[PDB]
Amino acid sequence: QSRGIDQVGLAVAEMDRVTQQNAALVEESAAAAAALEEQASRLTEAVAVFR
Amino acid sequence: MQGELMRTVGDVRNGANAIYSGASEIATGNNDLSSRTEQQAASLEETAASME
Amino acid sequence: MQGELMRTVGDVRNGANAIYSGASEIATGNNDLSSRTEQQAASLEETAASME
Numbered sequence: 001q002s003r004g005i006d007q008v009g010l011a012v013a014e015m016d017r018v019t020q021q022n023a024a025l026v027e028e029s030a031a032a033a034a035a036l037e038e039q040a041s042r043l044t045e046a047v048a049v050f051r
Numbered sequence: 052m053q054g055e056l057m058r059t060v061g062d063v064r065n066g067a068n069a070i071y072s073g074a075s076e077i078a079t080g081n082n083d084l085s086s087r088t089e090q091q092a093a094s095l096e097e098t099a100a101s102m103e
Numbered sequence: 104m105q106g107e108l109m110r111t112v113g114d115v116r117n118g119a120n121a122i123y124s125g126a127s128e129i130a131t132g133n134n135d136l137s138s139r140t141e142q143q144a145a146s147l148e149e150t151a152a153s154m155e
Contacts, residue, residue, distance in 0.1 A: 030081035046114035
């Protein structure tokens with residue numbers, strides 16, 4: 001059991017570290033997605049002269 | 052030339068909204084997905100304390 | 104009239120490439136994030152097996 005808890009402990013540490021990596025991709029995807037919203041607005045500014 | 056111009060601006064106008072609307076859908080998913088990420092992270096902390 | 108048309112084409116064409124390139128970053132992020140999800144679930148299966 002002591003050895004099993006160790007494997008589970010290291011597993012939680014691995015999943016915990018992997019969770020931080022996923023959060024970085026979530027924020028990166030959200031930040032990248034927010035950038036597309038700005039690029040879409042720039043398209044309207046170029047055609048702002050027209051209707 | 053005017054017709055091709057309006058149709059071109061129309062596709063860009065209607066198409067530009069798809070990117071903003073589409074990006075908002077993905078952005079909303081990241082916000083909701085972030086909730087489960089933090090919630091799932093709390094499970095590891097609570098579970099880690101349980102192993103102790 | 105051509106000056107405003109060429110400028111719009113350049114801004115839309117160059118700007119459209121940013122959306123395609125930027126969208127690829129999100130798609131690439133989901134692919135990389137998807138790999139972590141598979142490994143994240145695999146850890147639960149391996150961790151759950153240890154609990155048995």
